[PDB]
Amino acid sequence: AAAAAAAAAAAAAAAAAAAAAAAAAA
Amino acid sequence: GPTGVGKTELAKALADFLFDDERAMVRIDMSEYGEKHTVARLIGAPPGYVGYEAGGQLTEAVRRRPYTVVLFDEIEKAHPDVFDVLLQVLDEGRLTDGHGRTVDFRNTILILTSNLGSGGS
Ligand SMILES: Nc1ncnc2c1ncn2[C@@H]1O[C@H](COP(=O)(O)OP(=O)(O)OP(O)(O)=S)[C@@H](O)[C@H]1O
Numbered sequence: 001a002a003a004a005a006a007a008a009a010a011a012a013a014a015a016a017a018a019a020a021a022a023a024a025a026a
Numbered sequence: 027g028p029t030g031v032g033k034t035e036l037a038k039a040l041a042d043f044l045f046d047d048e049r050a051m052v053r054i055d056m057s058e059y060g061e062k063h064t065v066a067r068l069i070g071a072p073p074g075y076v077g078y079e080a081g082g083q084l085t086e087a088v089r090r091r092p093y094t095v096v097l098f099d100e101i102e103k104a105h106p107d108v109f110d111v112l113l114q115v116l117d118e119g120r121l122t123d124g125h126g127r128t129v130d131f132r133n134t135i136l137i138l139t140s141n142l143g144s145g146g147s
Contacts, residue, residue, distance in 0.1 A: 023076050026063050 053097040070124035098138035
């Protein structure tokens, strides 16, 4: 008499980023 | 004046009197600074260079404990371009660093010892 009615979802996964930090070469 | 008269000793007794301690004084050398590019220890580095999140020696040392006495021992050995930095410490009481945060030396003692002369009047 009762039905289940499966549902959806939403997944998040972000991304890191790097800085390069130049060197004045002396 | 002459050597061995007790300049650093007077500075350390003065730091003893109004802190009851010995590590409140900030002694920075001047025999390290023969090379011209070695000035940036006491400022920092402009944005885009290697040491940037750290900052400077003489600025992070005074952003905390803002009542210290500072010492510039033997300022003759420094070649004439370090003199242009502490030119604006005096007469203004401010200094800037890599982030752009003006630290203020408005209530510190500045004492810089020398060795010129040594025999004359
Ligand atoms: N007027 C003084 N009264 C007591 N002790 C002194 C006095 N002058 C010198 N001394 C002693 O001699 C030592 C040298 O004195 P300082 O003033 O520390 O020398 P200094 O300032 O390093 O000299 P320079 O020129 O920088 S090598 C200290 O360890 C003191 O204990």
